[PDB]
Amino acid sequence: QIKAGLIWMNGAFVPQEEAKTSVLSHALHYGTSVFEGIRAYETAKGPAIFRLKEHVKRFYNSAKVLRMEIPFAPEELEEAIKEVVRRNGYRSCYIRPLAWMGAKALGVNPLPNNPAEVMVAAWEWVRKGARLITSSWARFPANVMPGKAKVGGNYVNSALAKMEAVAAGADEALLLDEEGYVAEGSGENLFFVRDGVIYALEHSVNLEGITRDSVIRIAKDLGYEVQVVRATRDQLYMADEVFMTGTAAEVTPVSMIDWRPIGKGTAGPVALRLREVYLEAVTGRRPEYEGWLTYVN
Amino acid sequence: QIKAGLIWMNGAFVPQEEAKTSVLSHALHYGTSVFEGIRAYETAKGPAIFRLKEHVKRFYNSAKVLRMEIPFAPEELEEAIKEVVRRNGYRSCYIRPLAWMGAKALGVNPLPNNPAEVMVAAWEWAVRKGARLITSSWARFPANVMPGKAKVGGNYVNSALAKMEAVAAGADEALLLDEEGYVAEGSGENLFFVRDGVIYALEHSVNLEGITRDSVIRIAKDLGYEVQVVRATRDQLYMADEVFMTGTAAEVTPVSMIDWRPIGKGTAGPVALRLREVYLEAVTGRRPEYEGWLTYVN
Amino acid sequence: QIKAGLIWMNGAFVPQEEAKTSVLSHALHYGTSVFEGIRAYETAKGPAIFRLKEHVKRFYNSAKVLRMEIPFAPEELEEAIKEVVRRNGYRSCYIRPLAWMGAKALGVNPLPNNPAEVMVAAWEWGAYLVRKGARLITSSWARFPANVMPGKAKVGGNYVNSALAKMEAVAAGADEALLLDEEGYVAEGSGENLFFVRDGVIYALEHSVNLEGITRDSVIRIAKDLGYEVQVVRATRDQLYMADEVFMTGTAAEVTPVSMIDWRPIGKGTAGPVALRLREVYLEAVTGRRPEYEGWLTYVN
Amino acid sequence: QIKAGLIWMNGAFVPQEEAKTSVLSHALHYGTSVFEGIRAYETAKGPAIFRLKEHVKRFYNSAKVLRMEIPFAPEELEEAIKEVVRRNGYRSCYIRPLAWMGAKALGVNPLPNNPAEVMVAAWEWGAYLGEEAVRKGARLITSSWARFPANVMPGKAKVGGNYVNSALAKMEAVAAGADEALLLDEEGYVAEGSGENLFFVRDGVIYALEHSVNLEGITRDSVIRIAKDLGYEVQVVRATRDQLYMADEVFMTGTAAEVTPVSMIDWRPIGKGTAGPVALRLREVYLEAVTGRRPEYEGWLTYVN
Amino acid sequence: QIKAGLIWMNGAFVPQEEAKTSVLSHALHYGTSVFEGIRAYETAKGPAIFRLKEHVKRFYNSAKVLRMEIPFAPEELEEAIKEVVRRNGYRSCYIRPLAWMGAKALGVNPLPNNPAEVMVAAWEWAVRKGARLITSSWARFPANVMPGKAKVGGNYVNSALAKMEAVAAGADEALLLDEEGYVAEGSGENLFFVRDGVIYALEHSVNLEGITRDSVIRIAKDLGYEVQVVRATRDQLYMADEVFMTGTAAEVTPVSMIDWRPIGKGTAGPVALRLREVYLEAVTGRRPEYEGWLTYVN
Amino acid sequence: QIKAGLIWMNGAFVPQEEAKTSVLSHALHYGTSVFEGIRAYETAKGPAIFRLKEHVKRFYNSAKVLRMEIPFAPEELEEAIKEVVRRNGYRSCYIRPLAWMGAKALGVNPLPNNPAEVMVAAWEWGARLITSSWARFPANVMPGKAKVGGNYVNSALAKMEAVAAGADEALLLDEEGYVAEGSGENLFFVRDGVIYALEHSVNLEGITRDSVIRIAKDLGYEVQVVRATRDQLYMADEVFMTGTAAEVTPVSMIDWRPIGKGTAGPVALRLREVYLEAVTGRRPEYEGWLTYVN
Ligand SMILES: Cc1[nH+]cc(COP(=O)(O)O)c(CN[C@@H](CCC(=O)O)C(=O)O)c1O
Ligand SMILES: Cc1[nH+]cc(COP(=O)(O)O)c(CN[C@@H](CCC(=O)O)C(=O)O)c1O
Ligand SMILES: Cc1[nH+]cc(COP(=O)(O)O)c(CN[C@@H](CCC(=O)O)C(=O)O)c1O
Ligand SMILES: Cc1[nH+]cc(COP(=O)(O)O)c(CN[C@@H](CCC(=O)O)C(=O)O)c1O
Ligand SMILES: Cc1[nH+]cc(COP(=O)(O)O)c(CN[C@@H](CCC(=O)O)C(=O)O)c1O
Ligand SMILES: Cc1[nH+]cc(COP(=O)(O)O)c(CN[C@@H](CCC(=O)O)C(=O)O)c1O
């Protein structure tokens, strides 16, 4: 079981055992929910939530894609997110906001079910490099599933790929789009390095990662040249380095893809350095990035 | 609110109010659930569930796709489905079995959450004018993106988007095309068209293998119609003598217009209407040759 | 120049020189027209139009796709089609019915331009009545997906794709172009449907993104009547390269044996026995020499 | 009916009633024609045609795609385009040059029909002095018709046949209650409107869509230059429908559309739900440019008087 | 090392050691070769080659695709194939005929290199528990990218990549999907599935028109099975009662699992096992009805 | 026949007639080989191999895609490549390194056949294009970033088609309809003074393409990397191809439609001249790209 503790349920905190919803909820049957992944890191000045406003903005943006109505103002949700950390006495934790279509009706159309129900829960929270395998499941085309949003149903595609990779003996799955180009990991964005240049993948059908965005800024600040391009699986095979970014994965070096060693076959210097500086940034050690932090105290 | 009444929750019936699950359930966050749609009709011999066996079989098959483990034998679920009708005193109703990944963990990989939790709920459940459809701007998922042969919760985000669009456009239902441009299926039903006396069922492609579609093809052949299974384009439908949809909820529904273009005479056609009539006769227990499709609750 | 003669213009015949339309016509700028291609053959009983009703039905079906309103009943157009042959004294000829959006406005939306203007013209064709076989070349232009252009209708704009393919084929030294769909499978010729024969079996291609040819339909019925097994399938270019025979069908092409594709000889390298036989029977049918196919003919006199 | 007046027909102007062609013209049957869309605006120095040479260049480029021969030097067409404005006494008008394959033959191959016949027509265009419609923003709906792949129809050319695709999408959108259609390419990415190019704005940055299978808009080009001149950062990217749904602003550009703010797509409000400050500003400066009020953009204007 | 023995080289047999070609051969650089896979089985009347004529016909058909010229008459190759078996004293063996572009030049265009050089080699020649497959991340080539109806050397880079992936993942074979997401074929075999007693062969799509597939369909029909040819998705296979592959080397091989999802009972099924056994009886000369498919070497 | 002379075979030079391999070699049956194309030009200081380091790196990168093991260190291959020029007395030549899967087994899986066999041979060394009916392979069908033997069946089919159609070279589109590359060259086009290099997409990352971009930028030309359609090329002021063998080749016509003036344009001609000056060691700023054999 998950140790969440007090959970914010539509305006008020309640014990975990009470945070329940009808099994007739539209989202439990049709994947009609949206969520976010936000982290808080321990700093010298107490817990700090990383880029809270960008994550909340995306939460509401994801809802707009489903024409879902969130019956709370962003400011309220932001307060609830800060409270779920305080009330549970968390320091380093992962925060999971969730908006879903309730049980007013079960016709496939979700509009009659508005406004959505909302909740916020949270729980306490490489050298060799991660091993990836390209999935047999293609990332959804942009006119099939809304890839720029974190819609529950989207993750069926992520789930299928993740299970496949794990079953194949790898750590994570790398999905290609329907055209054969690299898209993203089941829950991460991808980058590769070649001849000193850092290449971030275009958005294509992927989620516009906030970690990806953060990584790019940091890389440029450190003096690296950054290019945004479309990439094939063999451009990664031949890269000096490859790494993934994501709220949970932070910056994760990738040492192998499809049993083919990337560069030296272990985490490379660029990825390790980016990961380290990113960690310094989220823990409040870089004044230049203080704007990204929200201290709960 | 939905008037379901007593709901079967993992082996036992409980009041609708007690039928709840954690908001940390994997399926609530990642669309990792499977469900079925089954109907019971009133007959002179009491309520009869239509093709219960095929529906339960597909329920388990859908789970297989997600590598989801349903901790109950098919027979148990079948008894539960009959009892949800009995205990609630239903005659004409829609039955909704649901299997979903619980709250053991929230990593995207659902395997650690097995076995799945299960519940069965049910609730009491123009035509000549014909239904009006509009082709959706959302394409049906390719066979290597989402498992279209299964009724996986997440799949219905695609259906929901198309349905909302169709309704917002003033139509009754959406018609989705696959990514290559061919007709696929409705947001919740299969498609057929008729041309020069020949009935054309659409290939399975990326669609669900409808049980109503299956029933309709058998009925059509029994009535003596030639049936061909083909791939179809939107303009083949525009030029057809008739078009109709099939589905557990839609039964056999004639389609009189698509994209503001009238189909044939612009109203329900004779073939679709005959198939609908025989189908209704079958599900209400008035066709001896199709009694094998019914499961009498009493 | 085209020797059309008397042309039916929205209800009445006028000399060719008078059959004109404004250069501001919607169809001249946006390809918003639909047309048909119908052949009339000289028979022992005078000119006979081949499957007139099927063509007229398709003409109206094509208009339906563009939400184009044709201000004439099918019966009126069929009478006009018969009359264009008679009034010009034609025997064997090609008939070109055309409906186009007029000059009421030039907004891209054609609806405000309804109803469409209509005309029926015809000219002598096939004044004389292959063994070497036609040479095809696979085009670099793909036949339009079914959600890009309405391939089941004969919409004017559709033929830009056909025109591009045909020019390419001729420039490459071939007789006709063979287009593939966007997925890579064989679709149809720039203006014909395709068939192939392998081990005695006749394979007609599925409709996919192609026009449902009336000649294709006729050839299939003829093949079955002759006792041939006919299968409808999806095909790749190399399935054709390896076939014993390949042939095209179309109102203008009739039944044309294909002896070479992409410089690779098909079977024996010349027209095969099956295609030649189907062609002979088809020609006997259209010229009124087959009682079993009289239903397909409409004698003008 | 269209009030065109005197029309330039293959070298000479004729009354509208006489500007006709045979119903056996190749282009009337097979969409084998090319055309342009050019605007003339009133200025303190009389009517000014916007980016005439760029439009004429595209006209001849479109013909090249069809292997169509235009039997007139670009200099002649440009003069005819000027004369069509003068002769008809127009101030604010839309100009429609057209080149189509004639009636020499009706084989699908158009080569035998060369050279193409040509005409230049024009009609008054009402100037908009209001603001409510503009500030309310246009409503778009994503079409069920995909924009043609680059190996199906030549999307960089203004070929008549191409517009069957645009027409089907426009009718659909209008029937759905929207003002315009937004077409996606076969892969699912945003392409362009039935007759406009698309842009979106996010966090102060202007994003122009890549050319992909779309027409390379001359208005799009002008808008990008204006934006850069005003100090905005402009990026060229590929976009999905949901990137537009969550953008701060979305707007269309086109000779007829000028710069049109888009406030809603698929019933989902864009940003504030009305025209945004960025699109409104670009429209403002664009209009000042075509009306001869921006000295820095005078090179784009051709005065007829 | 491969124990081939005497190899037929452009007209005459030579010791294996002498069966070599220039490293400047066009086919070694650009995949411009064609080949066949033919089997001989031991019968009561000595070695018998299975459907030699069809295989030779396909050999020349494949060459036609590359505009490759085989400087030998089919009858000559057929004799060479029979001789590679008897001169080596083989009973049960696999025969590999090969035609490749030589070292006349190395421009990518192979026409200047005609005619092709040809050789015929042969060597002495899962089913119990069923094979385990995994869907590849490499899509089968579209019909306008590589000629899938021909056995062109270059094509097998796609097969090789898929097979390596499947083996590295712990499976026996790879199942490739086409670019659209539908099931295509194995890296070296065709696919079939069984549902409710009905046998479903997959359409040719972008796959090779297998001779074993052809044989299997005829046998299945002769045995009274209903056989349908269709387009299939991965989940249609997941939900099938049985799945099996066919190929010259694979013969008829039952598939008990795909992507770690058990097929039906999770072991070789009865239909696949029966088709395999009847096929073996046919190739070993025990079924008079299929004698026409055999070419006795003695 | 090819006048190659002495060929480096797995560590040692041997006469051409002795450079042979078993007809049972995996690569001869399944296209499982990788190769390179390298040129040496005459200079005032003797023969110079152009960007040897980059070609060798790509060679090993190509093998990785097939999970092919090359039993020699890159430094060893470099020496062999230089030696093949020396020992044959070559000045202006084309060098063809090749690694292929041998005859240990003929199962489709190449792994059991490792390590690969390797050889290095060499021999003394506007355009009209036509768009091919064969599409360049998608990135999940064949590894387009590597020079794998099997990949060239697609190139061979397109080249034969172009030549049969009367053209000099074939222009392939990807499955989506966009321009990809030539059967053996990369493509660029010019419009209003701006040079447009095509994105890598499913193409090979040409070393000549890379060199041309640097040259262009040094000359002051603005260079943009974009995706392109066939009609963008039809409407361009110029079009040209780049490749080790093709160097910088102007394209005057595509699909019988003249490009711009219909003859080689000014930009392509200047890039060609600077490139030729560079490879022949007449450009000090580009000397880093040359490896002198003597
Ligand atoms: C498909 C997907 N792509 C990219 C990302 C990376 O985006 P960002 O987090 O904004 O940099 C994420 C979040 N991946 C979540 C994984 C869920 C888990 O608990 O595991 C995350 O990091 O919350 C995705 O789900
Ligand atoms: C995508 C889909 N396609 C086809 C069908 C038709 O299949 P069948 O029901 O076996 O004949 C259904 C069930 N559509 C469900 C929608 C009902 C609802 O209220 O939601 C149904 O009929 O249960 C689908 O969801
Ligand atoms: C794209 C197309 N495909 C198939 C056919 C064959 O259909 P059918 O004619 O019904 O059997 C035709 C008619 N081709 C007309 C135009 C050719 C011409 O220019 O002439 C025709 O034969 O009238 C087509 O235009
Ligand atoms: C498909 C298309 N796309 C983009 C554009 C925008 O391009 P530009 O005008 O060069 O900036 C146009 C011109 N749309 C013409 C016709 C539509 C109308 O009638 O209005 C136009 O605006 O003249 C198009 O037709
Ligand atoms: C791609 C492919 N598909 C289907 C087949 C099956 O076709 P058939 O053999 O005609 O029924 C084969 C032959 N696969 C050869 C590989 C064996 C080997 O690796 O050795 C075979 O069975 O000879 C293929 O290579
Ligand atoms: C498909 C392909 N694409 C692009 C290129 C250009 O890359 P580069 O050489 O690194 O700039 C080459 C090399 N073409 C080789 C083969 C041609 C030949 O057969 O000769 C070459 O030029 O060596 C290719 O084979």
Side-chain angles (χ1 to χ4, degrees), chain D residues 44-74 76-81:
Chain D
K45 296 168 56 183
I49 301 172
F50 193 67
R51 304 189 71 171
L52 167 63
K53 288 180 174 176
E54 193 63 22
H55 277 284
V56 170
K57 168 183 283 189
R58 190 164 65 189
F59 189 66
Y60 284 77
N61 274 161
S62 296
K64 272 200 166 187
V65 178
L66 288 184
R67 294 190 65 189
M68 169 191 280
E69 297 297 318
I70 300 178
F72 301 89
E76 301 177 62
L77 270 293
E78 296 175 0
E79 182 54 50
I81 292 177

Side-chain angles (χ1 to χ4, degrees), chain E residues 19-21 23 28-31 33 35 96 98 106 108-109 111 138-139 141-142 144-145 153-154 157-158 160 164 179, chain F residues 19-21 23 28-31 33 35 66 96 98 108-109 111 134-135 138 140-141 149-150 152-154 156 160 175:
Chain E
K20 300 186 186 300
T21 193
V23 296
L28 198 64
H29 295 248
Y30 311 120
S33 65
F35 67 85
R96 170 56 62 82
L98 178 80
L106 279 178
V108 72
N109 184 344
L111 288 174
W138 290 91
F141 34 60
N144 65 335
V145 171
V157 157
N158 182 254
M164 280 196 285
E179 202 58 276
Chain F
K20 308 190 69 177
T21 193
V23 297
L28 195 64
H29 296 237
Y30 310 124
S33 66
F35 68 89
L66 286 179
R96 169 59 64 78
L98 174 76
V108 76
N109 188 339
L111 292 181
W134 292 92
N140 63 330
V141 174
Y152 291 78
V153 161
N154 181 259
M160 289 194 284
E175 205 59 276

Side-chain angles (χ1 to χ4, degrees), chain A residues 37 58 94 139 150 155 184 186-188 207 209-211 246-248:
Chain A
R58 194 167 68 188
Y94 180 84
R139 198 56 177 169
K150 302 193 69 177
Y155 293 80
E184 70 188 334
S186 72
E188 310 89 352
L207 188 68
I210 287 176
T211 305
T247 295

Side-chain angles (χ1 to χ4, degrees), chain A residues 30, chain B residues 37 58 94 140 151 156 185 188-189 208 210-212 247-249:
Chain A
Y30 311 124
Chain B
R58 188 170 67 188
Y94 181 77
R140 200 58 178 169
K151 301 194 71 174
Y156 293 76
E185 60 183 349
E189 51 284 272
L208 189 70
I211 286 169
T212 310
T248 291

Side-chain angles (χ1 to χ4, degrees), chain A residues 21 28 33 96 138 143-144 178, chain B residues 21 28-29 33 139 144 158 179:
Chain A
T21 189
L28 200 67
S33 66
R96 171 56 65 78
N143 65 331
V144 171
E178 201 58 272
Chain B
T21 192
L28 198 63
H29 299 240
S33 68
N144 63 334
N158 181 258
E179 203 61 272

Side-chain angles (χ1 to χ4, degrees), chain D residues 250-269:
Chain D
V250 173
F251 63 90
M252 308 179 279
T253 61
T255 294
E258 291 169 337
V259 176
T260 297
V262 171
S263 56
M264 176 177 281
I265 304 178
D266 300 324
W267 311 99
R268 296 166 173 75

Side-chain angles (χ1 to χ4, degrees), chain B residues 68-74 76-83:
Chain B
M68 172 189 276
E69 304 291 352
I70 298 174
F72 298 93
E76 289 190 67
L77 191 70
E78 289 166 358
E79 178 54 45
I81 291 167
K82 300 175 190 174
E83 286 179 47

Side-chain angles (χ1 to χ4, degrees), chain A residues 56 58-73:
Chain A
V56 171
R58 194 167 68 188
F59 188 63
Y60 284 77
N61 274 164
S62 288
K64 186 185 305 182
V65 178
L66 290 179
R67 296 187 62 187
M68 173 191 278
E69 298 300 321
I70 294 176
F72 302 91

